[PDB]
Structure 1
Amino acid sequence: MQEHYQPAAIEPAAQKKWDDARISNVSEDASKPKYYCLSMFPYPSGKLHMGHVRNYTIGDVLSRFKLLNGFNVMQPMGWDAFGMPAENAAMKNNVAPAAWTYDNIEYMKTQLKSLGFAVDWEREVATCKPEYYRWEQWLFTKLFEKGIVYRKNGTVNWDPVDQTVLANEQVIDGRGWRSGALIEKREIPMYYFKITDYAEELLNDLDKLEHWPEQVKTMQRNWIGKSRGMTVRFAVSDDSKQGLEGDYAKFLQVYTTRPDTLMGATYVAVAAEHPLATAAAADKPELQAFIAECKAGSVAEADMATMEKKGVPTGRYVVNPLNGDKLEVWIANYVLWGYGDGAVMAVPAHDERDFEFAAKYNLPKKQVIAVGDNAFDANRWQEWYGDKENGVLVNSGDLDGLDFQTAFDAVAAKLQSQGAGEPKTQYRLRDWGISRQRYWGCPIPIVHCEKCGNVPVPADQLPVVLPENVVPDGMGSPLAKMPEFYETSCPCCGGAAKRETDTMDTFIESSWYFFRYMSPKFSDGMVSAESAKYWGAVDQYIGGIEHAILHLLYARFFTKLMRDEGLVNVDEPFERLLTQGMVVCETYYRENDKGGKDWINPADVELTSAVLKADGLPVVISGTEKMSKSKNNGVDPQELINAYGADTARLFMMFAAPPEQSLEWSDSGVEGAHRFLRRLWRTVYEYLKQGGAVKAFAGNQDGLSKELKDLRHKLHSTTAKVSDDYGRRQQFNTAIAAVMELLNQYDKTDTGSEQGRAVAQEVLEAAVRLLWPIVPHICETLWSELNGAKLWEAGWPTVDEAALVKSEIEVMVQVNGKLADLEAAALANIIVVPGRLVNIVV
């Protein structure tokens, strides 16, 4: 054993020892209990970043621990390969997106392997391969024939200078983000998943996820957004029926979740597309301009509630069906056509948006809800205005005194008797649009024929292959410009026909890949039935919080789709879910001779102030934020590995913060992690150079010294602490601190005697197994110096409950014949014959 710790000498050999033993290459062996530990697979970006290393180290800690506990552990890895990154890299570099993607995959694979993740590489998938995406084309055709996937015209933001479609996230002040050109709203046919057919299942099944963070579940519930309310029809006043036709001339129908406040409605509001808006804007230009601004908006949903609410009176009136009050109709920008009836009622006394709106326009507020002897101020909003559970109705004639649920029913009966309304369940959830006007994505398996319509490609003709021999030029989606791809024959009638040129939303690949990993070379279906039966669901999923809504919902949806097709037998893909925090770092800048800032990379700055590393001109240290190319503050993990080895990188990431907390880059803390590894190395080297290995202490410990009993207490306390930090808390930094404390006590204990060595052997053999999930290379190497058994069949350390009982302090006591450290406990009820009796001289 070399005296100095040299990670490049040891990490390659340890990796070849794990690979030679095929310990991460698992099969469906019904003899070992399974465990499926999954980290969210990466985009083949080019190179790993520190978020990648944080995530896959967390995955590896948990997989290695469960493996050491005897589980058949599958930890798979692959590549979320489609999407815009490669398309833009292709445009800028004059290279095919596929060629760029496959080179990135090859490089990033090398990096992952060198970090020593215990990954089953025989299960690798790449989603841009036809061996992969044919199976989502297959599922699509099945759901298309069932109406679960359907085609319908929708509205997109068209950028006419860049000749491509943009999401609302890419529209700033009505303009394209790169081009700066005004976007055009266009109606085009697109494809949708009927996810709203499964809304109630997706909402309720969340309740089975006892090992999910409540915040993720609550975020899903808000997105689905179920409400039970009331449809209410307000009759249109005779004076307001001009330009209306059909049911819109007779009534304005609305949806509300608060029918118990219908006596408090002081006005109604309609979307800009609503026929009432159209009819009243006919002669009023300010209304026309307000309607146009609403249509031109591109407010992303994450920003919807933040937009400033605005409205315009129409001069048309409807009649409240419970009290006959005539309310003015307003066009408002927060009422969205396609949600419900595109019209709402407004109660400023008990809904805060209605309060702020009515306060803006001086619209009236009528209190109808009381909560205790609380005063009602019509000019200031108090939180109890919105209380549903503890309110009672006031100012509502027949309904005064009722609580929420009784009044809801009373209103329902009143409205139904009248023909004016009925209970109604609604969901904020929209159907899922999967059409993308992009080249680098999975082709949609549809052929368009003027005789037969939109026809699915039959199963025998899948995949529809995306041609890899393409270089996007910017001027529009390539597939629409390639007759060699879209010109075909109709599979139903044989006649002239055209393939669909839109590709799929890339969320589709990531909605089922965890099942594909179960049988990644299966060519007769999405996932083999035998391997789905064995692996079941993912036991532990690890990933970033930005995927808590869309990706998770989509995966849960696809799992229930696949379940209903007969392919899988679970309701939920993910049992345990762990959300890792961001990785952030200091920023540095010089100022520009244009009044701006040039963001410098940390690698080219030295500290003391701070300046360049090759130069000496100072920089300006500024704030800490998530690593990103925007402020040039990303720290390249390959240079951290080059400088210190993989074990140091993995230890720093786990020690620096709990996985949920944001991790702050620290040169100082990276050096602390390395020196701790050096210390682990030296501790074992020094122990072995003073006598060589011995049989680890085991068994009855009566007759060990006090000092060595104490070390065994700390030893077995550490084992239970660590096990509970890996298994229960998932708090890997406290488990490292625990092992450091154990080595501190060992450093202060004399282990020179014969029984001393046996306890030191025990301590050290436990320490390196306890830390093997975090830094497996050095622990594998040191374990081989201490003990000749395979580390992984030695298995996780066991707690010795005997070493936790602390030995008895037993004696009797007597005041006047009749029944410092003992005289202090025995006065808590003065001779003291050593050990047996305490006599208290009365």
Structure 2
Amino acid sequence: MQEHYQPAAIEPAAQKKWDDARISNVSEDASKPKYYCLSMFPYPSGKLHMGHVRNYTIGDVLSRFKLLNGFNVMQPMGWDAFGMPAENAAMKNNVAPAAWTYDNIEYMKTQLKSLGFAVDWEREVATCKPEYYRWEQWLFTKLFEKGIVYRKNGTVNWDPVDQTVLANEQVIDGRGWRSGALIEKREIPMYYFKITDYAEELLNDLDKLEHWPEQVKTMQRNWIGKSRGMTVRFAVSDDSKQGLEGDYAKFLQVYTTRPDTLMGATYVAVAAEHPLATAAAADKPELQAFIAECKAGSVAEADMATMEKKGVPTGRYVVNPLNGDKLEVWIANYVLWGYGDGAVMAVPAHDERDFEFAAKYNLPKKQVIAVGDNAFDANRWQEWYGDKENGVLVNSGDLDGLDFQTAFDAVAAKLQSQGAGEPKTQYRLRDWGISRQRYWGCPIPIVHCEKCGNVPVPADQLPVVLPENVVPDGMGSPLAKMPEFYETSCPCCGGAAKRETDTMDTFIESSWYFFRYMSPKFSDGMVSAESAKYWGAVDQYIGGIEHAILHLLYARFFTKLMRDEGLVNVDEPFERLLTQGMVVCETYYRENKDWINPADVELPVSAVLKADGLPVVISGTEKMSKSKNNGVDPQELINAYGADTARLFMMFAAPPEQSLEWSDSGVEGAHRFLRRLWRTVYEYLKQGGAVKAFAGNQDGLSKELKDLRHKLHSTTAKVSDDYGRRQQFNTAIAAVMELLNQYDKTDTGSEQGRAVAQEVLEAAVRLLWPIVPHICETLWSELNGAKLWEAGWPTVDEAALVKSEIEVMVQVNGKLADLEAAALANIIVVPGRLVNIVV
């Protein structure tokens, strides 16, 4: 055994030992309990970053833990290859996105193999290969003829300079981020997944996810946004019907989730595209400018509540069908045309948004809800104004005294009696638009024929291969400029036809890749029936919190779609979910700001550039990114200390949910502990060699060795509970360090002492194997000759936890240090089990 810990010597040999044994290459063996541990597969951006290393180390710790407990563990890896990154690097390097993608895949695959992740590389997938996306094109065609996928016109943001479509997140003050030109709003036909049909199922099945973070389930419920409200129709006053036609001349229909406060409505608001706004603005220039300003907006839901709400009166009036109050209609900028009826009512006394809106324009506030003896200040909002559970109605006529639910049915009864309204259920969830005007993506299997219409590609002709011999210039979608691609024949009549040049949303490939891992070479479907029946669903899922809404909701949606097609048998894809925190680092620059990467900086007084001696400016600590040039390359971390030191540093610096801060001193400490672990096993084997680990009746051991066995098996139970239940790996590392400290302070020189020392070391290297498997595999082969994965997870000897009982009999006046203070708690004693009290 080498005296000093050398990572570059043991890590390749340990990885070769694991590959030759094929411990990670698992199949559908029905003679062993399966476990599907999955980490979110990465974009082949070029090289790994610290966020990747943390995620896949967390997944490998859990996978190796289940592996040591006898599970048939599958930990697959893959590449989310489609997207704008490859298209942007194409425009900057004059290289095809496919060639740029495949080079990154082979390089990042080399890095992942260097870290020693126990993954099944025989199940590797790449979403940009036709062997993969042929099946999402297949599901598209099946759902297209079923109506789940449909095609209709949708409004997009067009940049007339960059010649591309931009999202609302890419529109600043109505202009593009790169071009800076005023964006144009055009209606173009696009494809949609009718996800609203599964809205109630996607909402209620969240309750099954008992091992999901409650904030993630809460984030999905709010995004779905189911509300059980009331449709209310306000009769248009006879003096306000000019310019209106049809039902819009009869009434103004709104939707509200608080019909118990209908008596408190002081005004109503419509959208800019509402016919009431159109008729009222026909002769008012100030309203036409307000309607044009609303239509030219681009407020995303990530900041639609931070939008400055504003409105303008119209002069038209409607009638409240429950008290006769003549209410004026306003044009508001928060009423969205397409949500409900494009019109709402406002109760400023019990809705915080209507409160601020009314206080802005000095609009009346009518209290109709009272919660106890709480005072009502009309010039100050209080949280009890919007209470529903503990409130009764006031100033509501014959509705006073009722709570929320009874007044809900009471208002519904009156509205349905006169035909002025009825209950209704709605959802904030919109349909999923999947059309993208880019090249580097999965083609949409639709052929356009002027005789047959929008026709899906037959199953025999799939896939519609995306040509990889393309270098996008940027003046539009390259597929739209390639007649060799889109010109084809119609699959129904055989005449001249054009292919769909748009590609699919890249979230589609990540919505089902967890099923493809079960049979990534199955040529007859998305997933074979025998594999999906065996592996079932994903037991453990690890990924960042940024995907807690869209990606997870899309995966649950696709799971139910595939289930209803007889492909899979599960209702949910992910049983357990672990969201990892971000990785932050300090930033440095040199003004002239010119941010410098920390790997080239040398420092507690100040810091300076490693290339010379020019002092740098230390700035704030932020998440690692290319914005402030504070990303620390993980490859340099491996080249300096080895893979085990990197894994150990990330699992010990912070719990997985908590954000990890980069620290050069912390990396040195992790490497220093690995030296200590190596030195400990070496010094033990030098003074005698390996022996048989202690086992059996511990009675007869010294008090010192009994305490070391107590600390040992309590540490095993602590680590086992930290891996299985809490999933808090930094505390498990601390527990093993505490065991080694007591080992250092224990005389293990005797024959029975060596046996306990062997039991301590054989357990410590196995408890730390899921975290640092390279050095643990090497140290285990020096202490024991058997296979580590065949020895299994260390068992807890509960006999070593039961402490010795101090039993004796007390005696006061004849009849019935350490033992005297306990007896006096309830005069010389006998050194044994007898204490006499001379009173």
TM-score by length of 2: 1.00
Deviations 1:236-269 (A, max 9, x none): 0111111111000100000000000000000000
- 2: CA distance, partners of 1:67 / 1:474: 49
Question: 1:688 aligns to what SS in structure 2?
Answer: helix
- 1: CA distance, partners of 2:333 / 2:756: 74
- 1: CA distance, partners of 2:743 / 2:420: 81
- 2: CA distance, partners of 1:333 / 1:772: 59
**1:691-840 to 2 correspondence within 5 Å?**
691-840=688-837
- 2: CA distance, partners of 1:389 / 1:101: 55
- 1: CA distance, partners of 2:837 / 2:501: 98
Deviations 1:256-290 (A, max 9, x none): 00000000000000011100011111111111111
- 1: CA distance, partners of 2:263 / 2:827: 85
Displacement of 1:195 in angstroms is 0.1
* 281-290 or 380-389: bigger deviation: 281-290
* 829-838 or 557-566: bigger deviation: 829-838
Deviations 1:314-357 (A, max 9, x none): 11100000011111100101100000001000000000000000
- 2: CA distance, partners of 1:326 / 1:786: 89
Displacement of 1:617 in angstroms is 1.1
Question: 1:649 aligns to what SS in structure 2?
Answer: helix
Question: 1:282 aligns to what SS in structure 2?
Answer: helix
- 1: CA distance, partners of 2:346 / 2:758: 75
Displacement of 1:300 in angstroms is 1.3
Displacement of 1:293 in angstroms is 1.1
Question: 1:454 aligns to what SS in structure 2?
Answer: strand
**1:592-611 to 2 correspondence within 5 Å?**
592=592, 597-607=593-603, 608-611=605-608
Question: 2:293 aligns to what SS in structure 1?
Answer: helix
- 2: CA distance, partners of 1:549 / 1:272: 30
Deviations 1:416-444 (A, max 9, x none): 00100000000000000000000000000
- 1: CA distance, partners of 2:827 / 2:608: 73
Number of matched residues? 838
- 2: CA distance, partners of 1:633 / 1:763: 41
Deviations 1:601-659 (A, max 9, x none): 10121115111101111111010010000000000000000000000000000000000
% same residue? 100
Displacement of 1:820 in angstroms is 1.1
Question: 1:591 aligns to what SS in structure 2?
Answer: coil
Displacement of 1:392 in angstroms is 0.2
- 2: CA distance, partners of 1:817 / 1:829: 17
- 1: CA distance, partners of 2:572 / 2:309: 39
* 529-538 or 831-840: bigger deviation: 831-840
Displacement of 1:453 in angstroms is 0.4
- 2: CA distance, partners of 1:646 / 1:355: 58
Question: 2:298 aligns to what SS in structure 1?
Answer: coil
Displacement of 1:29 in angstroms is 0.3
- 2:169 is the counterpart of 1:173: no
**1:444-483 to 2 correspondence within 5 Å?**
444-483=444-483
Deviations 1:181-233 (A, max 9, x none): 11000000000000000000000000000000000000000000000000000
Deviations 1:742-781 (A, max 9, x none): 0000000000000000000000000000000000000000
- 2: CA distance, partners of 1:791 / 1:34: 19
Deviations 1:713-769 (A, max 9, x none): 000000000000000000000000000000000000000000000000000000000
- 2: CA distance, partners of 1:293 / 1:35: 55
- 1: CA distance, partners of 2:239 / 2:480: 53
Question: 2:700 aligns to what SS in structure 1?
Answer: coil
RMSD of aligned C-alpha atoms? Answer: 0.4
- 1: CA distance, partners of 2:174 / 2:511: 32
- 2:547 is the counterpart of 1:533: no
Structure 1 outlier segments of 4+, above 3 Å: none
**1:356-505 to 2 correspondence within 5 Å?**
356-505=356-505
- 1: CA distance, partners of 2:827 / 2:598: 70
- 2: CA distance, partners of 1:294 / 1:793: 68
Question: 2:824 aligns to what SS in structure 1?
Answer: coil
- 2: CA distance, partners of 1:225 / 1:62: 34
Displacement of 1:589 in angstroms is 1.5
Deviations 1:553-594 (A, max 9, x none): 0000000000000000000000000000000000011212xx
Deviations 1:390-435 (A, max 9, x none): 0000000110111000001000000000100000000000000000
Displacement of 1:73 in angstroms is 0.2
- 1: CA distance, partners of 2:516 / 2:285: 57
TM-score by length of 1: 0.99
Displacement of 1:599 in angstroms is 1.1
- 1: CA distance, partners of 2:26 / 2:827: 70
Please point out which of 623, 626, 634 is paired with 1:626. Answer: 623
Match of 1:63 in 2: 63
Alignment gaps of 5+ in structure 2: none
Question: 2:594 aligns to what SS in structure 1?
Answer: strand
Displacement of 1:836 in angstroms is 1.4
Displacement of 1:158 in angstroms is 0.1
- 2: CA distance, partners of 1:604 / 1:114: 23
Displacement of 1:38 in angstroms is 0.2
Match of 2:510 in 1: 510
- 2: CA distance, partners of 1:168 / 1:49: 28
Deviations 1:438-484 (A, max 9, x none): 00000000000011000000000000000000000010000000000
Deviations 1:101-149 (A, max 9, x none): 0000000000000000000000000000000000000000000000000
- 1: CA distance, partners of 2:276 / 2:404: 31
Displacement of 1:48 in angstroms is 0.2
Displacement of 1:835 in angstroms is 1.1
- 1: CA distance, partners of 2:311 / 2:710: 71
- 2: CA distance, partners of 1:146 / 1:254: 32
Displacement of 1:831 in angstroms is 1.2
Match of 2:269 in 1: 269
Displacement of 1:598 in angstroms is 1.3
Question: 2:611 aligns to what SS in structure 1?
Answer: coil
